Design an enzyme around this catalytic site. Structure first.
Site, PDB file in Angstrom:
ATOM      1  N   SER A 263       0.796  -1.203   0.000  1.00  0.00           N
ATOM      2  CA  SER A 263       0.000   0.000   0.000  1.00  0.00           C
ATOM      3  C   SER A 263       0.815   1.233   0.000  1.00  0.00           C
ATOM      4  O   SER A 263       1.794   1.345  -0.874  1.00  0.00           O
ATOM      5  CB  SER A 263      -1.064  -0.113   1.153  1.00  0.00           C
ATOM      6  OG  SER A 263      -2.297   0.319   0.610  1.00  0.00           O
TER       7      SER A 263
ATOM      8  N   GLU B  78      -1.354  -3.725  -8.374  1.00  0.00           N
ATOM      9  CA  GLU B  78      -2.616  -3.980  -7.628  1.00  0.00           C
ATOM     10  C   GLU B  78      -3.162  -2.692  -7.121  1.00  0.00           C
ATOM     11  O   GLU B  78      -2.442  -1.720  -6.980  1.00  0.00           O
ATOM     12  CB  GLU B  78      -2.298  -4.907  -6.429  1.00  0.00           C
ATOM     13  CG  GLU B  78      -1.526  -4.295  -5.260  1.00  0.00           C
ATOM     14  CD  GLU B  78      -2.335  -3.491  -4.276  1.00  0.00           C
ATOM     15  OE1 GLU B  78      -1.796  -2.514  -3.725  1.00  0.00           O
ATOM     16  OE2 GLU B  78      -3.500  -3.867  -3.990  1.00  0.00           O
TER      17      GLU B  78
ATOM     18  N   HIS C  69      -4.400  -6.267  -1.556  1.00  0.00           N
ATOM     19  CA  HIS C  69      -5.168  -5.944  -0.360  1.00  0.00           C
ATOM     20  C   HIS C  69      -6.183  -6.967   0.099  1.00  0.00           C
ATOM     21  O   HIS C  69      -6.905  -6.713   1.129  1.00  0.00           O
ATOM     22  CB  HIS C  69      -5.897  -4.536  -0.531  1.00  0.00           C
ATOM     23  CG  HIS C  69      -4.983  -3.351  -0.537  1.00  0.00           C
ATOM     24  ND1 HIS C  69      -4.151  -3.027  -1.606  1.00  0.00           N
ATOM     25  CD2 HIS C  69      -4.714  -2.450   0.441  1.00  0.00           C
ATOM     26  CE1 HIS C  69      -3.451  -1.958  -1.268  1.00  0.00           C
ATOM     27  NE2 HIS C  69      -3.760  -1.593  -0.041  1.00  0.00           N
TER      28      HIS C  69
END
Ligand SMILES: [Mg+2]
Ligand SMILES: [Mg+2]
Lengths: 305, 305
Positions: B108, B202, B272
């Site tokens: 992230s 992603e 995630h």
């Protein structure tokens, strides 16, 4: 007085608010304007306002559009301009705009096309109202209406507002628009490399942290500190959630200000609110912020004759 | 067996899920691991996990961290790493990682730090689980657990999955991570300039059109076509709304595929979701997609001795 020809283009999302587009068309025509290319309103392909081919030809066909004093009005934003950028006949559009230029106005997604026009030919276009959101609203906002016709009819004009920032004067090429769209062009052939400018930014439904993230990229890429001044417009749907715990747009302004040696002025009505000014991207601007208020004096853009 | 030392860092958002972090700490310690720097969990400054000074020192202090086989584990993502990038002692961290390297893992927001490590010293780090989301979930996902220890304990390892794409073989430097964070670095000093790579991407809570917009930027900036292959991971909270009218991730894959001459494989569990692999960014990867399935064979990363 100022009865005009509008020519619609729809490079972006499908017009779901059919009611509002036809309301905008009717309002323009009840005022004595005429609207061409009304067929773009019906067009649909998934979430886009027609096929890649059809949206592309809306733009490329502008090179053959020769009526005097034609206002080319984007219908709406969303997503879709980014898909077109590689196939647009940039040279032919740049060439068209060298004589008796079209007056091309839109905002949001359309920023990307406006940017590419700047990058390829310093071609001035207007960041301002679009058919659905502005002309087709329940009421036409008078501030926005005034400022649209103000830019398009006056070779030199002045905007004023009670801006927040240092007292200052700065002069240079006016550029910017939708922040997310400007970010989406970094590293690409359609990013304007304008130094010593007055860069004006706005956005919608971006949380403050995202706004910061974007401003910091423009900072770290060397774009912000190359300008003479930064102006922040409207940042709509950008109120904190619980987790933010005091983090808000004010924090964002403070954080960027602590990194900038050039002035940053906030509070302009520009972007997605019912009140927006119309800014000719690529025109010359003089920013003056005093204790009485802020002014921006703009010239060099094409106008209705 | 593999009882280890973890050292927490918190460069990003405040840990609101206090319960989940302490649950992750307890799970690691019940398995026989030891956790240092547990005080980072309490820290708060607005939406950040402490002041600029404190978050910055989490990172810069790693240069003095000398215990053998230390796993440095990011607590969580959010926003905050971008504020730190200009002040990180990149050289000192690069120098630290040249001998007896720390094993640094997160995902992230942390992508941006991982990216800067790559840009400055080709320093390999792990895009994989973090304390709160992964170790602190109600159940520890076994797939994720397995793949974490798989990467950290094996000098060469293979991931496999039923990927969709052409049958192909490609070899090069594994890079990528969170798509939005990678985008946020374009034009900045912390963007990795890795050619001929295997780029894995992603994201989370980005609508398909935003995902496309980002992929197209990477395309138009010349980044995608410089690679040997593109792999798409998990794109979480990315289901269509009504307006999309058929527009979805499949459309995004099709649109990018029609522009790429290199293979694009989808369907990896990465990012995630509760199932994620752990990818050593900056390591060497061999992609093999056959009719039976997809494999990715990775080597060159540091491991637990
Ligand atoms: Mg300052
Ligand atoms: Mg292809």
């Amino acid at each position: 007085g100022h009865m005009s020809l509008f020519h619609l283009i729809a490079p972006s999302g499908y017009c779901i608010k059919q009611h509002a587009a036809l309301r905008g068309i009717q309002r323009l025509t009840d005022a004595g304007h005429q609207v061409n290319n009304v067929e773009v309103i019906a067009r649909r392909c998934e979430r886009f306002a027609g096929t890649e081919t059809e949206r592309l030809e809306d733009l490329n066909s502008l090179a053959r559009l020769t009526t005097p004093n034609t206002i080319v009005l984007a219908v709406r934003g969303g997503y879709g301009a980014s898909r077109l950028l590689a196939d647009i006949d940039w040279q032919a559009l740049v060439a068209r705009q060298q004589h008796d230029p079209l007056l091309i106005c839109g905002h949001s997604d359309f920023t990307a096309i406006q940017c590419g026009l700047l990058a390829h030919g310093n071609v001035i276009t207007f960041s301002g109202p679009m058919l659905v959101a502005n002309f087709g609203a329940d009421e036409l906002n008078a501030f926005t209406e005034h400022h649209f016709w103000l830019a398009l009819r006056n070779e030199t004009f002045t905007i004023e507002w009670q801006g927040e920032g240092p007292t200052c004067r700065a002069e240079g090429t006016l550029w910017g628009g939708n922040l997310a769209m400007l970010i989406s062009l970094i590293g690409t052939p359609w990013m304007p490399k304008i130094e010593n400018g007055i860069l004006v930014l706005e956005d919608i439904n971006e949380h403050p942290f995202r706004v910061e993230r974007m401003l910091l990229q423009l900072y770290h890429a060397g774009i912000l500190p190359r300008q003479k001044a930064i102006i922040l417009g409207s940042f709509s749907g950008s109120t904190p959630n619980d987790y933010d715990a005091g983090y808000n747009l004010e924090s964002v302004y403070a954080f960027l200000r602590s990194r900038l040696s050039i002035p940053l002025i906030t509070g302009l009505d520009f972007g997605h609110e019912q009140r927006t000014v119309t800014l000719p991207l690529g025109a010359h601007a003089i920013l003056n912020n005093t204790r009485e208020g802020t002014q921006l004096t703009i010239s060099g853009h094409p106008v209705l004759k």
